[PDB]
Design an enzyme around this catalytic site. Sequence first.
Site, PDB file in Angstrom:
ATOM      1  N   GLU B  34       0.896  -1.134   0.000  1.00  0.00           N
ATOM      2  CA  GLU B  34       0.000   0.000   0.000  1.00  0.00           C
ATOM      3  C   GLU B  34       0.932   1.180   0.000  1.00  0.00           C
ATOM      4  OE1 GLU B  34      -4.129  -0.905   2.400  1.00  0.00           O
ATOM      5  OE2 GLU B  34      -2.466   0.152   3.382  1.00  0.00           O
ATOM      6  N   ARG B  96      -3.777  -5.550   0.238  1.00  0.00           N
ATOM      7  CA  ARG B  96      -5.151  -5.034   0.101  1.00  0.00           C
ATOM      8  C   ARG B  96      -5.542  -4.881  -1.354  1.00  0.00           C
ATOM      9  NH1 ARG B  96      -5.203  -1.818   4.357  1.00  0.00           N
ATOM     10  NH2 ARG B  96      -5.926  -2.830   6.281  1.00  0.00           N
TER      11      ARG B  96
END
Lengths: 228, 228
Positions: B34, B96
């Site tokens: 991320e 994610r």
Amino acid sequence: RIKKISIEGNIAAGKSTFVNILKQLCEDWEVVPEPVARWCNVQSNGGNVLQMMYEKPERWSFTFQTYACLSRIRAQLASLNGKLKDAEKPVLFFERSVYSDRYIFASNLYESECMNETEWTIYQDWHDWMNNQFGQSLELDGIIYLQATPETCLHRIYLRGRNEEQGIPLEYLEKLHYKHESWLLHRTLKTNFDYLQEVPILTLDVNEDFKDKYESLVEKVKEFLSTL
Amino acid sequence: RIKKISIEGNIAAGKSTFVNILKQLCEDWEVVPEPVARWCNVQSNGGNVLQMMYEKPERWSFTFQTYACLSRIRAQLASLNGKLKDAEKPVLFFERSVYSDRYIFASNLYESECMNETEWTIYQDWHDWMNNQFGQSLELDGIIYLQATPETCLHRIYLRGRNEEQGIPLEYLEKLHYKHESWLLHRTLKTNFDYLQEVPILTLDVNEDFKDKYESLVEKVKEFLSTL
Ligand SMILES: O=c1ccn([C@@H]2O[C@H](COP(=O)(O)OP(=O)(O)O)[C@@H](O)[C@H]2O)c(=O)[nH]1
Ligand SMILES: O=c1ccn([C@@H]2O[C@H](COP(=O)(O)OP(=O)(O)O)[C@@H](O)[C@H]2O)c(=O)[nH]1
Ligand SMILES: Nc1ccn([C@H]2C[C@H](O)[C@@H](COP(=O)(O)O)O2)c(=O)n1
Ligand SMILES: Nc1ccn([C@H]2C[C@H](O)[C@@H](COP(=O)(O)O)O2)c(=O)n1
Ligand SMILES: [Mg+2]
Ligand SMILES: [Mg+2]
């Protein structure tokens, strides 16, 4: 494949009005209006993001300016794959370009302290990227600047209606005017797209009515397009 | 041409930690973290949008959640054209996916009344579109859910550091936990991407340390990937 012409002007200068006159002068001439419709009613009687920006800019100038530019790209890109695509001598007129979105309105809102550093950094960053993917096909072939004193515009804002823009003061239109002048007339306002550098720009004085004298203007436009 | 696996987990569950262990177990296994780096510094010295969201969510939950998802796509799409692209049996692990962005965090922030109707409508609308252009190649082949009690996460948030998340209460992590459970375990949380419907999901209990027992976990992963 299609020649893309952008129609720049201040608020209520009269692009819509002026383009409709050209729209009906060829079947190979289409238009792509600012989706101001969806800005007054978000969707997928929702909400009026345009009004929110006006009521409290220091809060919605970012949210709006972003949705606004996104919505425009989505629209221009679409009309780009429309039936017009297969005609002979096609021309697509844009009501504003993503350039005035960022360099005229958004920019001016930031200078007016309605977008903080962080917001204005993100906006440029976002905008820079967006116009590097799809924007590759929305490159303009020419621009038509409908010049008009901010006072004339402030008047046409009243004549028009929109109960959102009724709170707009001359100052705002004035600031936005100089921005236009600096970019399309004096060509000193620097961008970030080194190609606008060599793009043709026809400027027309539209301070006097159209539905009448609109003959002269068209002549100058046919002329301009003939050289592209 | 690459198999794309997503590593879902709560905050500080331990994806980064867990993936690094897999990263060094093959040259045909890359990672896409991320970009939490750029979220804490937008200039790249500048403003910390992550912190802004935490200090006053009812104001920056939107701005953040948007930048966050944009930043992720930009990153996943890149590593997608990297050198890895030409290996033999390639695998790219995502920290994610844009799915948890919208259905776990953003969603939960809206229900927590930090995004008003208008903001949450735009977000979905924006997100729906974005994942229809580029998202066409970011489709997942599998997902690995690192399950862990919110308390364990709250602990690892402390062990980690980040002076932004130090204000986070259990309630928040708890709410985010159920969201994960509902989506990846009970599979009742409905999306808007009818393909996640038939996507494999390996769930691993990561409440006990890794740097030790991490042998068992890897075994189960090699196993999982072998069936794709
Ligand atoms: O010669 C003119 C040209 C325009 N208008 C007014 O301009 C308004 C429209 O402004 P417009 O929406 O075209 O600004 P734009 O949307 O093109 O930027 C109309 O209501 C007209 O009444 C006018 O009164 N006389
Ligand atoms: O068995 C473990 C695995 C991880 N950690 C802690 O987890 C933190 C990292 O959390 P992480 O950043 O991996 O959460 P993520 O970014 O993967 O979502 C590290 O500081 C470790 O100290 C730990 O204490 N024991
Ligand atoms: N990039 C843009 C485009 C439009 N508008 C808003 C300002 C006015 O209220 C209205 C102007 O619509 P038009 O340009 O068709 O006159 O929409 C804006 O703020 N920023
Ligand atoms: N979609 C996301 C991703 C991250 N974060 C924020 C919340 C935490 O403060 C931190 C979590 O980073 P990570 O999920 O890698 O632990 O970043 C968020 O709010 N929404
Ligand atoms: Mg109009
Ligand atoms: Mg991490």
